[PDB]
Short mmCIF file of C-alpha atoms in Angstrom, two decimals:
data_model
loop_
_atom_site.label_atom_id
_atom_site.label_comp_id
_atom_site.label_asym_id
_atom_site.label_seq_id
_atom_site.Cartn_x
_atom_site.Cartn_y
_atom_site.Cartn_z
CA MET A 1 0.00 0.00 0.00
CA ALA A 2 2.91 2.28 -0.94
CA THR A 3 0.78 2.66 -4.20
CA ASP A 4 -2.98 3.42 -3.81
CA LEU A 5 -5.64 3.96 -6.58
CA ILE A 6 -7.79 6.87 -5.35
CA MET A 7 -10.36 7.24 -8.19
CA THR A 8 -11.05 6.38 -11.82
CA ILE A 9 -13.23 8.72 -13.99
CA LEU A 10 -14.93 7.19 -17.14
CA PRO A 11 -17.61 8.40 -19.66
CA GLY A 12 -21.08 7.58 -18.36
CA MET A 13 -20.27 7.94 -14.66
CA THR A 14 -22.25 10.35 -12.41
CA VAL A 15 -19.80 12.89 -10.83
CA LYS A 16 -20.05 15.68 -8.16
CA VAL A 17 -18.08 18.95 -8.21
CA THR A 18 -15.84 18.88 -5.09
CA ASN A 19 -13.80 22.13 -5.47
CA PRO A 20 -15.34 24.73 -3.00
CA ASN A 21 -13.97 27.59 -5.10
CA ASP A 22 -15.99 26.54 -8.20
CA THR A 23 -19.54 27.99 -8.68
CA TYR A 24 -20.89 24.45 -9.33
CA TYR A 25 -19.73 23.00 -5.99
CA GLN A 26 -21.89 19.98 -5.02
CA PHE A 27 -23.83 19.87 -8.34
CA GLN A 28 -23.99 16.42 -10.11
CA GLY A 29 -23.76 15.79 -13.89
CA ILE A 30 -22.79 12.85 -16.18
CA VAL A 31 -19.25 12.54 -17.74
CA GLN A 32 -19.51 12.74 -21.56
CA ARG A 33 -15.85 12.91 -22.77
CA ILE A 34 -12.27 12.93 -21.43
CA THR A 35 -9.75 14.59 -23.67
CA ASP A 36 -6.77 16.97 -23.71
CA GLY A 37 -6.38 17.28 -19.92
CA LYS A 38 -10.14 18.04 -19.33
CA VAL A 39 -13.27 16.21 -18.24
CA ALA A 40 -16.46 17.39 -20.16
CA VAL A 41 -19.54 16.98 -17.89
CA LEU A 42 -23.14 17.22 -19.23
CA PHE A 43 -26.08 18.84 -17.36
CA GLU A 44 -29.50 18.46 -19.18
CA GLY A 45 -33.07 19.71 -18.80
CA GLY A 46 -36.20 19.87 -20.87
CA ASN A 47 -34.98 20.98 -24.27
CA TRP A 48 -31.56 22.19 -23.23
CA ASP A 49 -27.94 20.85 -22.79
CA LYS A 50 -25.04 22.46 -20.97
CA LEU A 51 -21.44 21.08 -21.30
CA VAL A 52 -18.91 22.25 -18.77
CA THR A 53 -15.15 21.39 -18.63
CA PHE A 54 -13.42 20.63 -15.29
CA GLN A 55 -9.95 19.39 -14.22
CA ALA A 56 -10.13 15.82 -12.85
CA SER A 57 -9.11 16.79 -9.31
CA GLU A 58 -12.29 19.01 -9.06
CA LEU A 59 -14.54 15.94 -9.36
CA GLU A 60 -15.56 12.76 -7.60
CA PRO A 61 -17.57 9.76 -8.78
CA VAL A 62 -20.92 9.11 -6.95
#
């Protein structure tokens, strides 16, 4: 236990925003894409989509 896996983030997982400096702190969305150092998270309602990019260390799987 010198080496410990802390978390894995994959498309399709539900994630929460865990950075208390970010305006979306505590909100939950679904991971859509991981690319170029960013995690793209989707929030959706009736007839709208919003895609927001975070750094991995700002998120946690739920």
